[PDB]
Design a protein around this nucleic acid. Structure first.
Lengths: 168, 215, 125, 183, 30, 196
RNA sequence: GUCAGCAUCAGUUUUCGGGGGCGGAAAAAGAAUAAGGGAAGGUGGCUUUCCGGGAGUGUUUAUAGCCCUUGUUGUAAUACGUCCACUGGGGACUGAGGACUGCGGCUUCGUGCCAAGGAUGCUGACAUAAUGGU
RNA sequence: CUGCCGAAGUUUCCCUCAGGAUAGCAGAAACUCAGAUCAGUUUUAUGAGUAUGUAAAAUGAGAGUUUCUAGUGGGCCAUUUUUGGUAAGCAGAACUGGCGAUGCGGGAUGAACCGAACGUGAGGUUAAGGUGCCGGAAUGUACGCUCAUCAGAAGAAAAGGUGUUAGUUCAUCUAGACAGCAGGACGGUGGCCAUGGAAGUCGGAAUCCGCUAAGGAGUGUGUAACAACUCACCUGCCGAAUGAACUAGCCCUGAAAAUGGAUGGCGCUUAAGCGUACUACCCAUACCUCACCGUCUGGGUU
RNA sequence: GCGAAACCACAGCCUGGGGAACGGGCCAGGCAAAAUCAGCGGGGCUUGUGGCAGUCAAGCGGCGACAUUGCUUUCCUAUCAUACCGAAGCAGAAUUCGGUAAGCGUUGGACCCACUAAUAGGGACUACUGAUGAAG
RNA sequence: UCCGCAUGAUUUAUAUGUAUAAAAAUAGAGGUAGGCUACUCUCCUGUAUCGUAGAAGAUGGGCGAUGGUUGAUGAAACGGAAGUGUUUUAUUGACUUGUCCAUGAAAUUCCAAUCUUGUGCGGAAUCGAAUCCAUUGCAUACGACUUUA
C-alpha cells in the first residue's frame, strides 16, 4: 500500500551556493526509495537541479492525523495523456489521505488506463465546507438521512443443498 | 456520442439582454416611480397588443416588465423602497401593473371587447350548424373558401368537393364551461369577442399624500 | 425492504478477525465503506467494508459520528444486547458456537440424551 | 446516483396488489392484471401513494422508472375512466362495409376500394368495436386497457392500406380521428 | 468464430505486424 | 467437499458453462453426476445473440457426405453434454470414462424425482449475473432450433410438481406433528446446554 | 534375510505459535478528564405549517450530539518496521564416512560426559512372503 | 565405445585462379617475473574543443611469450545510427548482438519472442508464464470501465454514433434556471422595384421606425393572392437545477467476398474481457543442500 | 483350373494453425466399431469518385480538413428475373431509383436476332456411390 | 429350472451409514389462528436433520412404555417420463438400553454382512427356431430381398 512521505532536499553546498535553500514536498510512494526517486525526478523537472548535485536532508513518513474522521479530499493532478498534457481534478471521500490517493490511482487506471508513471499529483486538499464540494456523487452522499439497500450483496463446499436466500 | 435533446437553432439575431434587460426594466421602474403624477398600477390583461397600443396612445407611459421584478428592485421593505408604506403595496403589487403618465374615468368606462382567452367562461352557448362552415355564425349575406382551414381544424370536418363540411353538429362553446385551448383556438377563427379589458386603480402613491389605497 | 444501511444500524461482522462480533454503524464513508464501533472492549472503532458485514434487523437511534463513549452509553441504554440475543437468529448462532466446543465425552453426553429424547414417539391414535 | 424516485398518487381505484412484479389493478370499471417482471425496480405502496424507487441505477435502467409510472397511470385511468378511440372511415367511390360480431370484438371489412377480399380482424382482449350513429361511417373502440385499444385501432388502420396507388390521390382508408375517454 | 474472419492472426501477421510497426517508428524518426 | 455415490443436480437457474466447468472437474474427480431439469439452464447474453451462436453451429458440416459431418444435437440435455465434453479430454480413455459418469436429462424422470437435488452456487445465475443483464434459457433456445419435445416435458413437469407438492404437504403434516412432540419432551432443555 | 513402527540425533528444509527488547510526530489514533474555540449533514427545542406524526423554520447543547486547539490521565496502548548468540510444536527428504586424534562445551579435576571432525537405539511381523529384477 | 579440449565465418595481406594466407580461435613443446604483469570495466587528474586521448586509483586475475599446426574464411535475424528516396513499400552503408555447435521451461503449435546454457539422482525454492475446465496452481481479495443482431481476450484510421462514464472551458439560475404550458407575438406597412396573381415567407438592395416586457420590412409550413399556424421575442402559472463547445476510457461503424473453423478448444458478460493494486499458490535441465560418476587442479605419502 | 509384374521408409478420415512447403505424422478440434463385394477414378493486398493553381480556415505548428473558383458439381452477393418494401408529377398502365433478399431460374441460333419473367456478375491407400455382413 | 445343502469359494470405481424428493422469487418467499383476508411469527445455506452406546456387536435379571426395531411374511392401495418403487398393512419369529445391574473378552501381550458364478447335490417339472439343400420373381452382377416347402 501507499504511504505519504515528506521529503526535504537540497543541492550540495559549494562556493557558488554555500547555503542552498531547503526544498520540501509531500509525495506518495509505496516505500522509502521510491519517494526519494520521485523527489529527484520532480525537482529536476520543475526547478532544474541535477540528481548528482543534490542530496536528501530529511525523509519522514506522515501518518493520518485523524484516521477515523470521515473527510472529503480534492485532488488536482497533471495527467500525461496521448498528447502528454492534460489536467484533472477529482473528489474523494474517505478517512485517510493515502486512501484517497490510492483510490485516485485505481480510478485513473480504470477510466483512463493510466500508469503510476503518467500521473503527477499537484495538490491534495482537505475540503470541509459542504457547499465547497463540487462533484455530484459526493454531494448527494453528504445529505443527512443517508440510507440504501446493501449494494451488490452477492451472498469450498460445492453442491449446496438448498437454493440460496441471496436476500434478506 | 450522448443521448440528449437536439436544440433547434435559427438566425433571428434578436436575443434579449437577459441581465441587462432586467437592469433596464429596474431603471425604468425607478424612473416611473420618479414620474410626475397619476400613480397608476395597471399594465396589461388578456387583450392583445392593440389594446395596449391604444392605451399608450392616450398618455404622454404604461409599462411593467417582469412582474414582481419592479417590486423587487424597489424593495418590499420600506427601508429599501423610496415610497412610504410599500410593505403592503408590494403584496398588492403583482401581475401586470405599471405606472403611467398622461385616466380614472377612461379606465372605469372605456372597456373594449376582445377575443377571449383560455380559462374563462363562455358568454353564451355557441353552436356550429352542420354543412358548410359559417365563419361568423351565418352572418355573411363566412364563405366556404376555407380550403386550408379544413386540414387545420382537426375537428369533425371533411372536405366535400372543395367545401369544408362538419358532418355532425359541433358545439363550439357553452356558457359556464372553462375555455379550453382548443375551444379558444377554434373560436379565434370566429368573431367571438368574449372578453373585456379592465384596469386597477385601487390606490395612488402620490409624492405628497403617499396614500395608496386598497380600493 | 428490511435491511437498510443506516447510521445507527447494528451489523454482524462476517469477515476478518472480528468474525461473529456485533457492531453498530456510526458513519457512512462512501458507497462501499462504513465506520463501525462496538461497546465491547476487544473490538476497536474502525472502517469496514460491506462484504465483511451483514445487516441486522435492529435500528437504534444514534447521532452522526458519535464518539466511542456516547455509542456505548446509547447501546447500554437502548439495550441492544439482550435485544439481539432475544431473536431466534442469535440463539441459532450461540447454539452453533457451543456445539463447536463440545468434546468427545460431551458428544457421548449428547448421544445419550437425544436417544432418550427420540424414544418418546408418543402420538395420538 | 443512489436513489432515483418517482411518485404516484392513487385515486379511488380499489385494489392495487403488487405481488411479484404483478399488479392486479381493479377499479369500478373492471380489473387489469399486468406484469412488470421485465424491469428490476422497487415498488412500494405507502397508503395513498406508490413509490417507484431505483437504487444505484444506470441511465439505461433509470429510464424505465418513468415508463413504469406511465403504464401504471394508464391502467389506473382505464379502471376509472376507460379509453375511447374514434376512427372515421374514408370512402371515395366504394363504400366500406363493416360487420360486427361477438359484441363487437371481431370486425369484418368488405368492398374496400372494390376489393372482394374479406378483411377480418379480431380485436385484442378487452376491446369492443361499435358503429356510432351520431356521426356517419365512423367507429368507436371502447376498452379498459389503452395498449390493447390503441393497438386494435392500429391493426384496423394497417389492414386497409392502399397498395401500388398514390397516397397523394388514392387517400382512401380507415383513420383514427379522436383519442379520448369514456367520461 | 462467429465472425466474418479469424481473430487468430496467422504467424505471418504476427511476423510482419511488428516489423511494419518498426518501419513506422523509423519513418517518424526520419 | 464430501462425495456421494451419485449426485443429482437440479439445473434450474444455473449457467451453462459455469455449471459445466464444475461438473467437468467432479467427473475427472471420479464421481457419478446426474444433471436434471436441463431445459431451464441459462446462458448469458440476450436470446437473439445466442440464437446466432447456435445457428452458426448448424453451419458446420463436412461438404463431402454430410453424414460424416458434425452432428448438431438440439435437446437441452445434449447441449449441456456438449459443453462438458468440450471441457474434458474426451480423446483419451480417462476423458472418455468421465462422460460415462455423466447423466444429462430434460426434466426429472421417476428414477430420480424421489431423491434430493443439490445446486452449485458457483454457477447460479442470481449470484453471478448483474441484475438487468439479458439472458436466455436453453429450453426456449432448443424449441426454436429443432427440439420438438418442449411442450410434453413442460406437461410432465406440471404433473410431477403436483405430485411432489402433495408429498411435501404430507411430509410437513408429519414433520409439524413430531416437532410438537419434539418440543414437548422435557429432556430437550436438559440437553440445551450442549446447543442441541 | 525382506519390510515396517517409534525414539533420540545430525544435515537440508517447510509451516504455524509464544515472549521480549528497540525505532517513528519517541507511531498517529483512542479512552478518560479539565479549559477555550467553532459550527453543522441543526438535535433538544424553536416557531410556523400541515396528516401522536410528517414537514420545515431560523438557530448554537439545552430533553442528541459533532468538529478544532490545549491540558491531563501519560511517560497510555496499538500498529508497522526492526532485532533477540529467547522460545514452543507439526511435516518431508537425506544417514555419505567407518578404530584413534581435532575444534569446543560441560565436566572434574585423574576422569570423564556431551547434540562437538556425516545414525544410532528399542521393537515387531514375514520365510512356499515381502522386496528386488525380467 | 566412452572421456577430455573445442573454433570459424570475418579478419592479415597477397594474388592469374580458386584460394591461400595471416590473424583469430583451439591448441602442442621451451623459458622469464610473484609482478602494476595484465583486462571487451569503472574512476581521478591532465591538455584539446558527457564523450577524447595520455597518466594514475578502483576492480578481478598469476601474468608473458618466441617456436609448429589442424579446422573455418559463409549467411540469416533484430537494434542503433543513415543518405537517396514515394501513394506505398525501397535501397545504401557502419556497428552491435543472437544464430550456426544448443538441448530445457513458457508463448495452443513455430529457425530467431520471454526465461534459462545440460553429468546420474533425492529434496527444497524460483524465473518466464500462469491459477474456470481441458491443465499443475485462488470460480482469490479490492476498486473501476465495458452489452456489442455475430463484444473482447501497425492497413484501410480520417471521420461518424439521440451509446456509456468521467473530466476541461464557457453560460443562465427563488429578479423563478431548462422544459412544459396559457397569452401576447403589434401598429406605420400590402415599406421600394419586381407581376396575371407576391400582402415578411416565387423573386433584387436596404430592411427604418411609436408602444415597449416583445413583436425580425420576418423562422418555416401554406395560400393564386389572402388569411392562419409555429418560431425569435416577451408575459402569466410552474418550482431548481439546467444548457453549449471540447478532451479522454470502453463500445458501435469506418467494405470483404466465394466447400465448414476457430481468443488453442469448451465456454465466459457485477467475466473466465479491459485496467490497477494486493496476497496466496503452481514449476525449468535454472538456483540451493546432500549423495554418486568422471575430468582437472592442489596438498600429503619409505 | 493355371497364375504374373511394376511398386514398397512407415502408414492412410476431415477443418483450421504451425514464419517456409504448410504436411500424412505436430497442435486445437470434428470424430472414431470387425470382415468385405461391385462401380466412379476424385485425390489484413483489393473496390465509388483525376491532375495543376489560388481562396478560405476547424485548428495545430507555415501548413491546414471538407468546400469555392479557374481548362481539359458446389459456393459468394457486389440481385438480371420472381417476393416484399420506401421514395419520385407515381392519375391508371408502364417505368425510374433505393432497401431486405441467393429460396429459386438466368435460353435457343450465325457483336449480332429472336424467344423469354430474366437471359446478373464472380470463386473453387482414402474418398464418393450402391451391396452384404459377424456381434453384444 | 429351483429346492437344496452346498462346496470350493468366486466377489465388488461396493464400502464402510450405498443415510435426506417441495415449488418459486432473489428490488422476495413461508408459517399461525379467526372471520378475500387485517395482524402475529420464520429466512441471514447442511458445522443441518435422521440414525449412531454392545464377545463387529455375547449370555441373563430387574424397573418402566405399547413403544422402537429388524429377518421372514399372507395380504390390499398407488407409482408409466426410464413405471428401478412408495405405502397400507395385519402377521410370525426375533431383537428387545428408555433405565439400572451380573457374567465373558486377554499371550491377536507397541501398527501391518452382499455379490454372484461356481460346480455339483437328490428331489420336483419342462418338450422351440433359423440357415444350407429345393422353390418363387413382386427381387437380382454375386450376396441380399419377396414367396413356397
Amino acid at each position: 500500500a501507499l504511504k505519504e512521505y515528506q521529503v526535504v532536499g537540497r543541492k550540495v553546498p559549494t562556493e557558488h551556493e554555500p547555503v542552498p535553500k531547503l526544498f520540501r514536498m509531500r509525495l506518495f510512494a509505496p516505500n522509502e526509495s521510491v519517494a526519494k526517486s520521485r523527489y529527484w525526478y520532480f525537482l529536476k523537472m520543475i526547478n532544474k537541479v541535477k540528481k548528482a548535485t543534490g542530496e536528501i536532508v530529511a525523509i519522514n513518513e506522515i501518518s493520518e492525523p485523524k484516521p477515523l474522521k470521515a473527510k472529503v479530499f480534492g485532488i488536482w493532478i497533471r495527467y500525461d495523456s496521448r498528447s502528454g498534457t492534460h489536467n484533472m481534478y477529482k473528489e474523494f471521500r474517505d478517512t485517510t489521505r493515502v486512501g484517497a490517493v490510492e483510490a485516485m490511482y485505481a480510478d485513473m487506471a480504470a477510466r483512463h488506463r493510466a500508469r503510476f508513471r503518467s500521473i503527477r499529483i499537484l495538490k491534495v486538499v482537505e475540503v470541509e465546507k459542504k457547499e465547497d464540494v463540487r462533484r455530484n456523487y459526493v454531494k448527494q452522499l453528504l445529505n443527512p438521512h443517508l440510507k440504501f439497500p446493501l449494494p451488490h450483496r452477492r451472498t469450498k463446499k460445492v453442491f449446496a443443498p438448498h437454493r440460496p436466500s441471496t436476500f434478506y | 456520442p450522448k443521448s440528449r435533446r437536439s436544440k433547434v437553432l435559427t438566425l433571428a439575431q434578436t436575443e434579449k439582454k437577459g441581465h441587462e434587460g432586467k437592469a433596464a426594466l429596474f431603471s425604468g421602474v425607478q424612473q416611473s416611480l420618479d414620474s410626475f403624477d397619476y400613480m397608476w398600477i395597471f399594465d396589461v390583461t388578456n387583450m392583445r397588443n392593440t389594446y395596449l397600443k391604444r392605451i399608450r396612445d392616450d398618455w404622454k407611459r404604461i409599462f411593467m416588465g417582469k412582474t414582481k421584478v419592479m417590486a423587487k428592485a424597489l424593495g418590499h421593505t420600506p427601508e429599501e423602497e423610496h415610497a412610504e408604506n410599500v410593505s403592503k403595496l408590494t403584496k398588492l403589487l403583482h401581475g401586470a401593473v405599471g405606472l403611467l403618465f398622461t385616466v380614472i374615468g377612461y379606465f372605469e368606462s372605456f372597456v373594449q371587447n376582445d377575443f377571449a382567452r383560455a380559462g374563462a367562461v363562455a358568454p353564451f352557448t355557441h353552436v356550429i350548424p352542420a354543412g358548410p362552415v359559417y365563419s361568423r355564425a351565418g352572418q355573411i349575406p363566412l364563405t366556404h373558401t376555407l380550403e386550408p382551414q379544413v386540414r387545420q381544424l382537426g375537428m369533425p370536418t371533411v372536405l366535400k368537393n372543395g367545401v369544408v363540411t362538419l358532418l355532425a353538429d359541433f358545439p363550439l362553446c357553452t356558457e359556464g364551461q372553462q375555455l379550453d385551448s382548443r375551444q379558444t383556438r377554434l373560436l379565434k377563427l370566429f368573431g367571438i369577442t368574449a372578453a373585456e379589458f379592465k384596469v386597477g386603480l385601487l390606490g395612488y402613491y402620490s409624492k405628497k399624500g403617499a396614500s395608496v389605497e386598497f380600493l | 425492504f428490511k435491511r437498510y444501511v443506516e447510521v445507527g444500524r447494528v451489523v454482524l461482522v462476517t469477515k476478518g478477525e472480528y468474525t461473529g462480533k456485533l457492531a453498530v454503524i456510526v458513519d457512512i464513508v462512501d458507497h462501499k465503506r462504513a465506520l463501525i464501533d462496538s461497546p465491547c472492549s476487544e473490538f476497536p472503532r474502525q472502517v469496514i467494508r460491506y462484504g465483511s458485514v451483514v445487516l441486522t434487523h435492529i435500528v437504534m437511534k444514534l447521532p452522526r459520528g458519535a464518539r466511542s463513549g456516547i455509542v456505548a452509553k446509547k447501546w447500554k441504554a437502548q439495550d441492544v444486547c439482550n435485544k439481539w440475543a432475544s431473536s431466534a437468529w442469535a440463539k441459532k448462532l450461540e447454539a452453533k458456537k457451543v456445539r463447536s466446543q463440545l468434546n468427545d465425552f460431551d458428544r457421548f453426553a449428547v448421544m445419550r440424551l437425544k436417544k432418550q429424547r427420540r424414544e418418546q414417539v408418543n402420538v395420538a391414535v | 446516483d443512489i436513489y432515483k424516485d418517482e411518485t404516484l398518487t392513487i385515486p379511488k381505484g380499489v385494489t392495487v396488489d403488487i405481488k411479484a412484479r404483478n399488479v392486479t389493478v381493479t377499479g369500478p370499471r373492471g380489473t387489469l392484471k399486468q406484469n412488470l417482471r421485465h424491469v428490476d425496480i422497487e415498488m412500494k405502496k405507502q397508503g395513498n401513494t406508490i413509490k417507484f424507487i431505483v437504487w444505484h441505477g444506470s441511465r439505461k435502467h433509470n429510464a424505465c422508472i418513468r415508463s413504469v409510472y406511465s403504464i401504471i397511470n394508464n391502467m389506473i385511468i382505464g379502471v376509472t375512466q376507460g379509453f375511447r378511440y374514434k376512427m372515421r372511415l374514408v370512402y371515395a367511390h366504394f363504400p366500406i362495409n363493416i360487420n360486427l360480431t361477438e359484441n363487437g370484438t371481431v370486425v369484418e371489412i368488405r368492398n374496400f376500394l372494390g376489393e372482394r377480399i374479406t378483411r377480418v380482424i379480431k380485436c385484442l382482449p378487452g376491446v369492443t368495436v361499435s358503429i356510432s350513429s351520431a356521426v356517419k361511417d365512423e367507429i368507436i373502440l371502447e376498452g379498459n386497457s389503452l395498449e390493447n385499444v390503441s393497438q386494435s385501432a392500429a391493426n384496423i388502420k394497417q389492414i386497409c392500406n392502399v397498395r401500388n396507388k398514390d397516397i397523394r390521390k388514392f387517400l382512401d382508408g380507415i383513420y383514427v380521428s379522436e383519442r379520448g375517454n369514456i367520461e | 468464430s462467429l465472425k466474418k474472419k479469424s481473430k487468430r492472426r496467422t504467424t505471418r501477421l504476427r511476423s510482419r505486424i511488428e516489423k511494419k510497426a518498426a518501419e513506422s517508428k523509423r519513418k517518424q524518426k526520419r | 467437499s464430501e462425495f456421494q455415490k451419485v449426485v443429482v443436480i437440479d439445473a434450474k437457474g444455473h449457467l451453462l458453462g459455469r455449471l459445466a466447468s464444475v461438473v467437468a472437474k467432479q467427473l475427472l474427480g471420479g464421481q457419478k453426476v446426474v444433471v436434471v431439469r436441463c431445459e431451464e439452464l441459462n446462458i448469458s447474453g440476450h436470446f437473439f445473440r445466442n440464437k446466432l451462436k447456435y445457428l452458426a453451429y448448424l453451419r458446420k458440416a463436412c461438404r463431402y457426405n454430410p453424414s460424416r459431418g458434425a452432428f448438431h444435437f438440439r435437446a437441452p440435455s445434449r447441449i449441456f453434454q456438449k459443453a462438458v465434453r468440450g471441457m474434458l479430454p474426451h480423446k483419451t480413455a480417462r476423458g472418455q470414462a468421465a462422460l460415462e459418469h455423466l447423466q444429462a436429462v430434460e426434466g426429472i424422470p421417476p428414477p430420480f424425482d424421489k431423491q434430493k437435488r443439490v445446486v452449485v452456487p458457483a454457477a447460479l445465475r442470481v449470484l453471478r449475473l448483474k441484475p438487468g443483464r439479458k439472458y436466455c434459457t436453453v429450453g426456449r433456445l432448443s424449441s426454436e432450433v429443432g427440439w420438438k419435445y418442449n411442450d410434453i416435458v413442460a406437461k410432465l413437469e406440471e404433473r410431477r410438481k403436483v405430485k411432489s407438492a402433495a408429498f411435501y404437504q404430507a411430509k410437513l403434516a408429519k414433520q409439524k406433528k413430531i416437532a410438537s412432540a419434539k418440543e414437548a419432551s422435557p429432556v430437550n432443555q436438559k440437553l440445551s446446554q450442549f446447543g442441541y
